[PDB]
Amino acid sequence: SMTSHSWLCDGRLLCLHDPSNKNNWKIFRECWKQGQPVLVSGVHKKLKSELWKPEAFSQEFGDQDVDLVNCRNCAIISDVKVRDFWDGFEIICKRLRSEDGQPMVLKLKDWPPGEDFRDMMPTRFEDLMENLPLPEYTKRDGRLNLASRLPSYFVRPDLGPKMYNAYGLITAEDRRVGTTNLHLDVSDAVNVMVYVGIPIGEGAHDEEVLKTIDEGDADEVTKERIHDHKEKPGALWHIYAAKDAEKIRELLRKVGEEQGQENPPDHDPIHDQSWYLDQTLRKRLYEEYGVQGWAIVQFLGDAVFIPAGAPHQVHNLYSCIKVAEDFVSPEHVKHCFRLT
Ligand SMILES: O=C(O)CCc1ccc(-c2ccc(O)cc2)cc1
Ligand SMILES: [Cl-]
Ligand SMILES: [Cl-]
Ligand SMILES: [Cl-]
Ligand SMILES: [Cl-]
Ligand SMILES: [Mn+2]
């Protein structure tokens, strides 16, 4: 039977089932006021699927110059053609190779650049903005989005959306690395998985994706959604409550010290965006600081709602295209205020 919603993370995460249901706000707003993230699927069924394919981005924009990041060692690959990224998205034998002769796990940096998404891609902009869930919160002019309504005493978000494009992490050693490192945003955000690429050549990558999700602390219901082979898993997230940010900073200052970093006692390891919390660091955070997070597997068409101030990190399981919009809910406006 069709249902309005279900629970993940042992009851701690709301999962809404119908992205366009006008009653979603009634269930959403209680979880959101408590500082929890929220998951919505089925957003892929609302989109024009031909607009969000890697082959179309290559054909239409392939000649633009970009930088890439090597996710395994953070090296920057400067001033290459965006087609050099898109043509290896799902075919491993087309990927740029590191000096060891291995195909690289790459992230496309700042593309489209700054606030240019709407200008470069007006049909994609329309298709996304018209199908965002919780539209009173997430649209530029939604009645519960204060972005356009606030004075300069508040940090306002950039004009979005922003697109996040990266290959999936592959090996047992890749389990300890992030696609996006631990950081926080002063605005709220919704992140939609619009495309998941499951590769070929080295296309027998069944078991290590399962081990990554299990070691990632994914709940029993999430594990049932994986065993059921009906939906493509894109990325593993860890999200922490905004109120736990300083305890995470204390852990990371202590680990930096143990590892011989030489850092002023006030320096901000979350703002540095230099850490990924692996299985060891997540266990230590729980045991030594009493901090529990949310381990979330974002499937194709899942929209992840990230509360303002909530530290978070992303680990791609397969090749992903994600599109994110920032907004300012009245529930969390304190996080962007410039005084006390
Ligand atoms: O079980 C595995 O192979 C590893 C995890 C996983 C789980 C599900 C899929 C999948 C689902 C729907 C589909 O059309 C194609 C693929 C892929 C990967
Ligand atoms: Cl809060
Ligand atoms: Cl377009
Ligand atoms: Cl709404
Ligand atoms: Cl990063
Ligand atoms: Mn973020």
Curated annotation (Swiss-Prot):
Changing residue 167 to C: In DIJOS; uncertain significance. Transmembrane segments: none annotated. Residues 121-340 form the JmjC domain. Coiled coil: none annotated. Histone demethylase that specifically demethylates 'Lys-9' of histone H3, thereby playing a central role in histone code. Demethylation of Lys residue generates formaldehyde and succinate. May have tumor suppressor activity. Belongs to the JHDM2 histone demethylase family. This is Lysine-specific demethylase 3B. It comes from Homo sapiens (Human). The chain holds residues 1380 to 1717 of 1761 of the full protein.
